[PDB]
Amino acid sequence: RTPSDKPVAHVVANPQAEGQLQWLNRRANALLANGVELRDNQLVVPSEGLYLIYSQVLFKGQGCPSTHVLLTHTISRIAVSYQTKVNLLSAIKSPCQRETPEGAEAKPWYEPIYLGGVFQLEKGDRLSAEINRPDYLLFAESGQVYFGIIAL
Amino acid sequence: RTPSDKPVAHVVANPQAEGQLQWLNRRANALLANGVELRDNQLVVPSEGLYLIYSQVLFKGQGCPSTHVLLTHTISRIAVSYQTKVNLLSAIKSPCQRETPEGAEAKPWYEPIYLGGVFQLEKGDRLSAEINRPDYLLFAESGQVYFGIIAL
Amino acid sequence: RTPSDKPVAHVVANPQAEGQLQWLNRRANALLANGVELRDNQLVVPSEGLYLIYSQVLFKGQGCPSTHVLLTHTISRIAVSYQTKVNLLSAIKSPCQRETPEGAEAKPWYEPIYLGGVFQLEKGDRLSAEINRPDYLLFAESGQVYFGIIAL
């Protein structure tokens, strides 16, 4: 984990919570070292500094129901001074133009979303990566649904 | 604020700028730090070193118009020795592959392009980050379209 | 001398290669410095450290072929101890979900995929960026196909 004292975290999702996004620590490379902690599913940040922040979510859907599927992935900082979630990153993705699988019943889409960004954080700040539809989460984990920061 | 004696920058798209990607700092994490000067929509490099150049843009539209759009996102370098715009990171994105939609016309689409990599820049060379279709830019989320650097 | 004594890499994909992914520095914005070396198209890691490993591949295909194409992109660390491929990072996009374009010959789609994470390697490791379909890449690219590792 340490060498290089950097707050570092690279945390994997969890292929047990049937539809959810539980972050997991210890898998082959799931760095939670020196300073940063995961506490209620968030990366609590030590030090103070400019953290490079990243995550990827893989949404997986067999077919498309009537009405917009519209997926979303955000990373928000909950500040401990003037608190609350301040929005840092998120991206929107619509994986179906009207098709809506009757005919040749349900054949799959795959939608990766990846976020990356260098932000100034502060000692003790909490970090959230959330999706709006944990039903569409694929399972085959390590490099497929992940989250991380490193201090630069 | 400032940690480190690193040049950093994280500028954002002016949301009130009709049809042009125009950068901005002053905002949330809209850093211009140690010697990075933003100029004619571009970033002038202060120091010889590796920089991490990242950028994200978002594209929205509602319905898919005539047949073939192509959204492009390119970060370029107009360098202090090969003084010309060479090309650093680039992505093309096809929004809708048809619908054109007429039975029920404008259902919304959102495409996120993100870009980023380590390069060895020099003092004085500019970095540019344009998109070919500013009309397709989203300006309802700020944690969306930006451009930043940071020496490593 | 102040380039940097940091292991760094940024290889671009070679344009003269039919359906294969050949990585190449000795190119205009491709680094390889401080003992990293690209040996059998893979990256060998010089010292123990924490490394940001990132990767982008562009795919274009005109028309949407039958059944389901599925394009993948992953980075594997091929170790020094249990030295076979362990998947560090992975994404999967499917570009065609029906279209089959019959009385048409059809439109071209573009599909990019970005991969970036922080991982702890060990000395002598190898890292490989492998797509499942090289026959679908695109190279009037400058930054569209890349592989880079930087030591944090």
PDB file of N, CA and C in Angstrom, chain A residues 1-4 6 8-10 28-29 31 34 52 54 56 58 61 63-64 93 95-96 99 107-112 114 138 140 142-146 149-152, chain C residues 6 48-54 67-68 70-71 73 77 86-99 111-121 151-152:
ATOM      1  N   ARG A   1       0.940  -1.099   0.000  1.00  0.00           N
ATOM      2  CA  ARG A   1       0.000   0.000   0.000  1.00  0.00           C
ATOM      3  C   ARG A   1       0.994   1.161   0.000  1.00  0.00           C
ATOM      4  N   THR A   2       1.352   1.718   1.156  1.00  0.00           N
ATOM      5  CA  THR A   2       2.488   2.632   1.254  1.00  0.00           C
ATOM      6  C   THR A   2       3.719   1.801   0.852  1.00  0.00           C
ATOM      7  N   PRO A   3       4.670   2.045  -0.065  1.00  0.00           N
ATOM      8  CA  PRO A   3       5.473   3.243  -0.236  1.00  0.00           C
ATOM      9  C   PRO A   3       4.711   4.437  -0.808  1.00  0.00           C
ATOM     10  N   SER A   4       5.399   5.522  -1.209  1.00  0.00           N
ATOM     11  CA  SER A   4       4.784   6.756  -1.688  1.00  0.00           C
ATOM     12  C   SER A   4       3.752   7.323  -0.723  1.00  0.00           C
ATOM     13  N   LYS A   6       1.132   9.010   0.115  1.00  0.00           N
ATOM     14  CA  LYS A   6       0.054   9.653  -0.532  1.00  0.00           C
ATOM     15  C   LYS A   6      -1.034   8.960   0.258  1.00  0.00           C
ATOM     16  N   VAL A   8      -4.132   7.396  -0.617  1.00  0.00           N
ATOM     17  CA  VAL A   8      -4.361   6.669  -1.830  1.00  0.00           C
ATOM     18  C   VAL A   8      -5.549   5.821  -1.465  1.00  0.00           C
ATOM     19  N   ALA A   9      -6.445   5.642  -2.418  1.00  0.00           N
ATOM     20  CA  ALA A   9      -7.543   4.708  -2.247  1.00  0.00           C
ATOM     21  C   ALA A   9      -7.956   4.371  -3.643  1.00  0.00           C
ATOM     22  N   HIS A  10      -8.226   3.101  -3.769  1.00  0.00           N
ATOM     23  CA  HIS A  10      -8.688   2.489  -4.984  1.00  0.00           C
ATOM     24  C   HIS A  10      -9.493   1.398  -4.356  1.00  0.00           C
ATOM     25  N   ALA A  28      -7.350  -7.707  -4.588  1.00  0.00           N
ATOM     26  CA  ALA A  28      -5.968  -7.672  -5.132  1.00  0.00           C
ATOM     27  C   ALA A  28      -5.286  -6.331  -5.062  1.00  0.00           C
ATOM     28  N   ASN A  29      -5.996  -5.344  -5.608  1.00  0.00           N
ATOM     29  CA  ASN A  29      -5.548  -3.996  -5.463  1.00  0.00           C
ATOM     30  C   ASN A  29      -6.786  -3.187  -5.156  1.00  0.00           C
ATOM     31  N   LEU A  31      -6.344  -0.419  -2.560  1.00  0.00           N
ATOM     32  CA  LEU A  31      -5.538   0.403  -1.704  1.00  0.00           C
ATOM     33  C   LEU A  31      -6.426   1.236  -0.794  1.00  0.00           C
ATOM     34  N   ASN A  34      -2.708   4.759   4.182  1.00  0.00           N
ATOM     35  CA  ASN A  34      -2.206   5.905   4.874  1.00  0.00           C
ATOM     36  C   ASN A  34      -3.030   7.160   4.896  1.00  0.00           C
ATOM     37  N   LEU A  52      -6.666  13.919  -6.858  1.00  0.00           N
ATOM     38  CA  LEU A  52      -7.141  13.429  -8.153  1.00  0.00           C
ATOM     39  C   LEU A  52      -8.122  12.337  -7.736  1.00  0.00           C
ATOM     40  N   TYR A  54     -11.325   9.686  -9.146  1.00  0.00           N
ATOM     41  CA  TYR A  54     -11.783   8.976 -10.311  1.00  0.00           C
ATOM     42  C   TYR A  54     -12.801   7.891  -9.896  1.00  0.00           C
ATOM     43  N   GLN A  56     -15.533   4.540 -12.069  1.00  0.00           N
ATOM     44  CA  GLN A  56     -16.172   3.948 -13.237  1.00  0.00           C
ATOM     45  C   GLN A  56     -17.229   3.022 -12.735  1.00  0.00           C
ATOM     46  N   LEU A  58     -20.212   0.343 -14.391  1.00  0.00           N
ATOM     47  CA  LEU A  58     -20.636  -0.300 -15.624  1.00  0.00           C
ATOM     48  C   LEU A  58     -22.085  -0.660 -15.483  1.00  0.00           C
ATOM     49  N   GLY A  61     -27.734  -3.758 -19.246  1.00  0.00           N
ATOM     50  CA  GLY A  61     -29.169  -3.987 -19.318  1.00  0.00           C
ATOM     51  C   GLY A  61     -29.538  -4.869 -20.489  1.00  0.00           C
ATOM     52  N   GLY A  63     -32.021  -5.404 -22.885  1.00  0.00           N
ATOM     53  CA  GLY A  63     -33.215  -4.852 -23.488  1.00  0.00           C
ATOM     54  C   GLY A  63     -33.394  -3.469 -22.940  1.00  0.00           C
ATOM     55  N   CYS A  64     -34.554  -2.897 -23.212  1.00  0.00           N
ATOM     56  CA  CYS A  64     -34.887  -1.549 -22.795  1.00  0.00           C
ATOM     57  C   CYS A  64     -36.364  -1.506 -22.541  1.00  0.00           C
ATOM     58  N   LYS A  93     -26.194   9.521 -19.037  1.00  0.00           N
ATOM     59  CA  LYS A  93     -26.100   8.621 -20.188  1.00  0.00           C
ATOM     60  C   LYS A  93     -27.455   8.019 -20.502  1.00  0.00           C
ATOM     61  N   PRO A  95     -28.957   4.987 -22.604  1.00  0.00           N
ATOM     62  CA  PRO A  95     -28.583   3.887 -23.455  1.00  0.00           C
ATOM     63  C   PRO A  95     -29.635   3.393 -24.447  1.00  0.00           C
ATOM     64  N   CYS A  96     -30.888   3.905 -24.409  1.00  0.00           N
ATOM     65  CA  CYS A  96     -31.877   3.500 -25.410  1.00  0.00           C
ATOM     66  C   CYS A  96     -32.738   4.611 -26.007  1.00  0.00           C
ATOM     67  N   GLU A  99     -36.677   1.411 -28.726  1.00  0.00           N
ATOM     68  CA  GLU A  99     -36.474   0.078 -29.296  1.00  0.00           C
ATOM     69  C   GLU A  99     -37.393  -0.883 -28.563  1.00  0.00           C
ATOM     70  N   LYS A 107     -31.889  -8.305 -26.099  1.00  0.00           N
ATOM     71  CA  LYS A 107     -30.457  -8.529 -26.156  1.00  0.00           C
ATOM     72  C   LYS A 107     -29.608  -7.316 -25.701  1.00  0.00           C
ATOM     73  N   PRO A 108     -28.637  -7.526 -24.796  1.00  0.00           N
ATOM     74  CA  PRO A 108     -27.910  -6.523 -24.009  1.00  0.00           C
ATOM     75  C   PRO A 108     -27.185  -5.253 -24.472  1.00  0.00           C
ATOM     76  N   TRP A 109     -27.290  -4.182 -23.676  1.00  0.00           N
ATOM     77  CA  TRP A 109     -26.449  -3.002 -23.814  1.00  0.00           C
ATOM     78  C   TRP A 109     -25.397  -2.971 -22.706  1.00  0.00           C
ATOM     79  N   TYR A 110     -24.361  -2.209 -22.898  1.00  0.00           N
ATOM     80  CA  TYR A 110     -23.333  -2.056 -21.928  1.00  0.00           C
ATOM     81  C   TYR A 110     -23.044  -0.601 -22.036  1.00  0.00           C
ATOM     82  N   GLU A 111     -22.982   0.046 -20.865  1.00  0.00           N
ATOM     83  CA  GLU A 111     -22.753   1.458 -20.781  1.00  0.00           C
ATOM     84  C   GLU A 111     -21.687   1.716 -19.742  1.00  0.00           C
ATOM     85  N   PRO A 112     -20.411   1.956 -20.047  1.00  0.00           N
ATOM     86  CA  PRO A 112     -19.454   2.326 -19.018  1.00  0.00           C
ATOM     87  C   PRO A 112     -19.582   3.823 -18.652  1.00  0.00           C
ATOM     88  N   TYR A 114     -17.214   6.837 -16.788  1.00  0.00           N
ATOM     89  CA  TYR A 114     -15.996   7.063 -16.027  1.00  0.00           C
ATOM     90  C   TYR A 114     -15.882   8.587 -15.865  1.00  0.00           C
ATOM     91  N   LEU A 138     -23.637  -4.374 -13.343  1.00  0.00           N
ATOM     92  CA  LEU A 138     -23.051  -5.651 -13.705  1.00  0.00           C
ATOM     93  C   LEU A 138     -22.046  -6.108 -12.654  1.00  0.00           C
ATOM     94  N   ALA A 140     -18.624  -8.502 -12.260  1.00  0.00           N
ATOM     95  CA  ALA A 140     -17.520  -9.402 -12.640  1.00  0.00           C
ATOM     96  C   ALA A 140     -16.287  -8.636 -12.194  1.00  0.00           C
ATOM     97  N   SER A 142     -13.371  -6.324 -10.842  1.00  0.00           N
ATOM     98  CA  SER A 142     -12.312  -5.571 -10.221  1.00  0.00           C
ATOM     99  C   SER A 142     -12.336  -4.330 -11.098  1.00  0.00           C
ATOM    100  N   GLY A 143     -11.773  -4.375 -12.294  1.00  0.00           N
ATOM    101  CA  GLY A 143     -11.657  -3.182 -13.064  1.00  0.00           C
ATOM    102  C   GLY A 143     -12.876  -2.739 -13.774  1.00  0.00           C
ATOM    103  N   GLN A 144     -14.039  -3.016 -13.234  1.00  0.00           N
ATOM    104  CA  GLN A 144     -15.244  -2.776 -13.943  1.00  0.00           C
ATOM    105  C   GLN A 144     -16.185  -1.760 -13.277  1.00  0.00           C
ATOM    106  N   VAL A 145     -16.212  -1.802 -11.929  1.00  0.00           N
ATOM    107  CA  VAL A 145     -16.931  -0.810 -11.119  1.00  0.00           C
ATOM    108  C   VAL A 145     -15.912  -0.442 -10.029  1.00  0.00           C
ATOM    109  N   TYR A 146     -15.203   0.686 -10.082  1.00  0.00           N
ATOM    110  CA  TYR A 146     -14.164   0.987  -9.081  1.00  0.00           C
ATOM    111  C   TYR A 146     -14.231   2.439  -8.658  1.00  0.00           C
ATOM    112  N   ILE A 149      -8.922   7.956  -5.233  1.00  0.00           N
ATOM    113  CA  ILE A 149      -8.286   9.233  -5.008  1.00  0.00           C
ATOM    114  C   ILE A 149      -6.835   8.938  -4.709  1.00  0.00           C
ATOM    115  N   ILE A 150      -6.049   9.964  -5.062  1.00  0.00           N
ATOM    116  CA  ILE A 150      -4.650  10.045  -4.668  1.00  0.00           C
ATOM    117  C   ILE A 150      -4.186  11.495  -4.534  1.00  0.00           C
ATOM    118  N   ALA A 151      -3.385  11.775  -3.494  1.00  0.00           N
ATOM    119  CA  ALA A 151      -3.012  13.184  -3.310  1.00  0.00           C
ATOM    120  C   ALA A 151      -1.839  13.480  -4.226  1.00  0.00           C
ATOM    121  N   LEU A 152      -1.932  14.633  -4.891  1.00  0.00           N
ATOM    122  CA  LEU A 152      -0.873  15.110  -5.753  1.00  0.00           C
ATOM    123  C   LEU A 152      -0.449  16.418  -5.093  1.00  0.00           C
TER     124      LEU A 152
ATOM    125  N   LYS C   6      11.124  10.162 -12.542  1.00  0.00           N
ATOM    126  CA  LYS C   6       9.874   9.449 -12.263  1.00  0.00           C
ATOM    127  C   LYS C   6       9.761   8.437 -13.386  1.00  0.00           C
ATOM    128  N   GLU C  48       9.370  -0.402  -7.233  1.00  0.00           N
ATOM    129  CA  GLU C  48       8.115  -0.607  -6.539  1.00  0.00           C
ATOM    130  C   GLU C  48       7.575   0.792  -6.303  1.00  0.00           C
ATOM    131  N   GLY C  49       6.274   1.006  -6.489  1.00  0.00           N
ATOM    132  CA  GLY C  49       5.678   2.313  -6.330  1.00  0.00           C
ATOM    133  C   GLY C  49       4.176   2.215  -6.469  1.00  0.00           C
ATOM    134  N   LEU C  50       3.539   3.358  -6.466  1.00  0.00           N
ATOM    135  CA  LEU C  50       2.096   3.334  -6.582  1.00  0.00           C
ATOM    136  C   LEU C  50       1.941   3.963  -7.957  1.00  0.00           C
ATOM    137  N   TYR C  51       1.196   3.459  -8.906  1.00  0.00           N
ATOM    138  CA  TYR C  51       1.201   4.020 -10.240  1.00  0.00           C
ATOM    139  C   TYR C  51      -0.237   4.280 -10.697  1.00  0.00           C
ATOM    140  N   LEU C  52      -0.406   5.439 -11.344  1.00  0.00           N
ATOM    141  CA  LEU C  52      -1.613   5.774 -12.058  1.00  0.00           C
ATOM    142  C   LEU C  52      -1.374   5.081 -13.391  1.00  0.00           C
ATOM    143  N   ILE C  53      -2.252   4.145 -13.746  1.00  0.00           N
ATOM    144  CA  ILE C  53      -2.223   3.449 -15.062  1.00  0.00           C
ATOM    145  C   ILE C  53      -3.485   3.872 -15.837  1.00  0.00           C
ATOM    146  N   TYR C  54      -3.400   4.480 -17.021  1.00  0.00           N
ATOM    147  CA  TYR C  54      -4.584   4.893 -17.744  1.00  0.00           C
ATOM    148  C   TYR C  54      -4.603   4.381 -19.201  1.00  0.00           C
ATOM    149  N   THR C  67     -26.168  -9.822 -34.914  1.00  0.00           N
ATOM    150  CA  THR C  67     -26.153 -10.363 -33.561  1.00  0.00           C
ATOM    151  C   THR C  67     -25.487  -9.341 -32.597  1.00  0.00           C
ATOM    152  N   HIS C  68     -24.439  -9.630 -31.835  1.00  0.00           N
ATOM    153  CA  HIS C  68     -23.895  -8.579 -31.016  1.00  0.00           C
ATOM    154  C   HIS C  68     -22.406  -8.676 -30.938  1.00  0.00           C
ATOM    155  N   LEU C  70     -20.250  -6.377 -29.150  1.00  0.00           N
ATOM    156  CA  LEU C  70     -19.440  -6.297 -27.914  1.00  0.00           C
ATOM    157  C   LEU C  70     -17.932  -6.002 -28.139  1.00  0.00           C
ATOM    158  N   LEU C  71     -17.484  -4.809 -27.776  1.00  0.00           N
ATOM    159  CA  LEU C  71     -16.103  -4.409 -27.902  1.00  0.00           C
ATOM    160  C   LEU C  71     -15.567  -4.309 -26.454  1.00  0.00           C
ATOM    161  N   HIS C  73     -12.090  -3.720 -23.679  1.00  0.00           N
ATOM    162  CA  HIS C  73     -10.803  -3.105 -23.463  1.00  0.00           C
ATOM    163  C   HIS C  73     -10.424  -3.370 -22.007  1.00  0.00           C
ATOM    164  N   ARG C  77      -2.274  -6.805 -15.330  1.00  0.00           N
ATOM    165  CA  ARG C  77      -0.962  -6.752 -14.743  1.00  0.00           C
ATOM    166  C   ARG C  77      -0.557  -8.185 -14.859  1.00  0.00           C
ATOM    167  N   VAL C  86      -3.782 -10.596 -14.352  1.00  0.00           N
ATOM    168  CA  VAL C  86      -4.963 -10.317 -13.535  1.00  0.00           C
ATOM    169  C   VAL C  86      -5.458  -8.970 -14.001  1.00  0.00           C
ATOM    170  N   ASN C  87      -6.750  -9.031 -14.239  1.00  0.00           N
ATOM    171  CA  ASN C  87      -7.506  -7.894 -14.674  1.00  0.00           C
ATOM    172  C   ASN C  87      -7.532  -6.822 -13.604  1.00  0.00           C
ATOM    173  N   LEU C  88      -6.940  -5.702 -13.975  1.00  0.00           N
ATOM    174  CA  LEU C  88      -6.967  -4.524 -13.127  1.00  0.00           C
ATOM    175  C   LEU C  88      -8.156  -3.607 -13.479  1.00  0.00           C
ATOM    176  N   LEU C  89      -8.499  -3.447 -14.756  1.00  0.00           N
ATOM    177  CA  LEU C  89      -9.423  -2.456 -15.260  1.00  0.00           C
ATOM    178  C   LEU C  89     -10.087  -3.000 -16.530  1.00  0.00           C
ATOM    179  N   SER C  90     -11.316  -2.644 -16.848  1.00  0.00           N
ATOM    180  CA  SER C  90     -12.024  -3.313 -17.902  1.00  0.00           C
ATOM    181  C   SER C  90     -13.253  -2.493 -18.232  1.00  0.00           C
ATOM    182  N   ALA C  91     -13.582  -2.438 -19.496  1.00  0.00           N
ATOM    183  CA  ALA C  91     -14.821  -1.920 -19.875  1.00  0.00           C
ATOM    184  C   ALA C  91     -15.218  -2.665 -21.128  1.00  0.00           C
ATOM    185  N   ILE C  92     -16.540  -2.572 -21.383  1.00  0.00           N
ATOM    186  CA  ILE C  92     -17.246  -3.259 -22.439  1.00  0.00           C
ATOM    187  C   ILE C  92     -18.281  -2.346 -23.083  1.00  0.00           C
ATOM    188  N   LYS C  93     -18.252  -1.835 -24.310  1.00  0.00           N
ATOM    189  CA  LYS C  93     -19.406  -1.117 -24.854  1.00  0.00           C
ATOM    190  C   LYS C  93     -20.045  -1.962 -25.970  1.00  0.00           C
ATOM    191  N   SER C  94     -21.351  -1.985 -26.156  1.00  0.00           N
ATOM    192  CA  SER C  94     -21.889  -2.570 -27.337  1.00  0.00           C
ATOM    193  C   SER C  94     -22.436  -1.428 -28.206  1.00  0.00           C
ATOM    194  N   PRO C  95     -21.892  -1.144 -29.397  1.00  0.00           N
ATOM    195  CA  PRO C  95     -22.272  -0.019 -30.229  1.00  0.00           C
ATOM    196  C   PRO C  95     -23.548  -0.161 -31.043  1.00  0.00           C
ATOM    197  N   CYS C  96     -23.837  -1.414 -31.444  1.00  0.00           N
ATOM    198  CA  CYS C  96     -24.995  -1.735 -32.301  1.00  0.00           C
ATOM    199  C   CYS C  96     -26.095  -2.371 -31.483  1.00  0.00           C
ATOM    200  N   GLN C  97     -27.306  -1.907 -31.257  1.00  0.00           N
ATOM    201  CA  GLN C  97     -28.314  -2.720 -30.574  1.00  0.00           C
ATOM    202  C   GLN C  97     -29.445  -2.541 -31.543  1.00  0.00           C
ATOM    203  N   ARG C  98     -29.388  -3.556 -32.426  1.00  0.00           N
ATOM    204  CA  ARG C  98     -30.127  -3.603 -33.696  1.00  0.00           C
ATOM    205  C   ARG C  98     -29.678  -2.424 -34.610  1.00  0.00           C
ATOM    206  N   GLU C  99     -29.967  -2.454 -35.911  1.00  0.00           N
ATOM    207  CA  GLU C  99     -29.785  -1.384 -36.911  1.00  0.00           C
ATOM    208  C   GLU C  99     -29.640  -2.210 -38.195  1.00  0.00           C
ATOM    209  N   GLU C 111     -16.976   4.870 -30.755  1.00  0.00           N
ATOM    210  CA  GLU C 111     -17.212   4.359 -29.433  1.00  0.00           C
ATOM    211  C   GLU C 111     -15.916   4.506 -28.714  1.00  0.00           C
ATOM    212  N   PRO C 112     -15.625   5.441 -27.789  1.00  0.00           N
ATOM    213  CA  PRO C 112     -14.336   5.420 -27.090  1.00  0.00           C
ATOM    214  C   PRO C 112     -14.382   4.707 -25.768  1.00  0.00           C
ATOM    215  N   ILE C 113     -13.276   4.203 -25.215  1.00  0.00           N
ATOM    216  CA  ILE C 113     -13.277   3.684 -23.846  1.00  0.00           C
ATOM    217  C   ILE C 113     -11.989   4.031 -23.101  1.00  0.00           C
ATOM    218  N   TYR C 114     -12.255   4.686 -21.962  1.00  0.00           N
ATOM    219  CA  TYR C 114     -11.210   5.146 -21.066  1.00  0.00           C
ATOM    220  C   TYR C 114     -11.192   4.288 -19.802  1.00  0.00           C
ATOM    221  N   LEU C 115      -9.963   4.055 -19.399  1.00  0.00           N
ATOM    222  CA  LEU C 115      -9.600   3.262 -18.249  1.00  0.00           C
ATOM    223  C   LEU C 115      -8.526   4.024 -17.437  1.00  0.00           C
ATOM    224  N   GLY C 116      -8.709   4.341 -16.150  1.00  0.00           N
ATOM    225  CA  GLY C 116      -7.654   4.966 -15.403  1.00  0.00           C
ATOM    226  C   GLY C 116      -7.846   4.562 -13.960  1.00  0.00           C
ATOM    227  N   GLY C 117      -6.773   4.085 -13.311  1.00  0.00           N
ATOM    228  CA  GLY C 117      -6.788   3.743 -11.885  1.00  0.00           C
ATOM    229  C   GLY C 117      -5.416   3.845 -11.193  1.00  0.00           C
ATOM    230  N   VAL C 118      -5.385   3.773  -9.865  1.00  0.00           N
ATOM    231  CA  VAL C 118      -4.118   3.785  -9.146  1.00  0.00           C
ATOM    232  C   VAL C 118      -3.973   2.369  -8.635  1.00  0.00           C
ATOM    233  N   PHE C 119      -2.790   1.828  -8.876  1.00  0.00           N
ATOM    234  CA  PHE C 119      -2.468   0.489  -8.451  1.00  0.00           C
ATOM    235  C   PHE C 119      -1.004   0.385  -8.055  1.00  0.00           C
ATOM    236  N   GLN C 120      -0.828  -0.480  -7.063  1.00  0.00           N
ATOM    237  CA  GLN C 120       0.494  -0.825  -6.562  1.00  0.00           C
ATOM    238  C   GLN C 120       1.089  -1.951  -7.403  1.00  0.00           C
ATOM    239  N   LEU C 121       2.102  -1.669  -8.210  1.00  0.00           N
ATOM    240  CA  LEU C 121       2.806  -2.723  -8.898  1.00  0.00           C
ATOM    241  C   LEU C 121       3.984  -3.203  -8.042  1.00  0.00           C
ATOM    242  N   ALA C 151       4.298   7.217 -12.117  1.00  0.00           N
ATOM    243  CA  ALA C 151       4.607   6.847 -10.748  1.00  0.00           C
ATOM    244  C   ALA C 151       4.248   7.928  -9.764  1.00  0.00           C
ATOM    245  N   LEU C 152       3.323   7.617  -8.885  1.00  0.00           N
ATOM    246  CA  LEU C 152       2.999   8.477  -7.771  1.00  0.00           C
ATOM    247  C   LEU C 152       3.667   7.929  -6.507  1.00  0.00           C
TER     248      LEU C 152
END
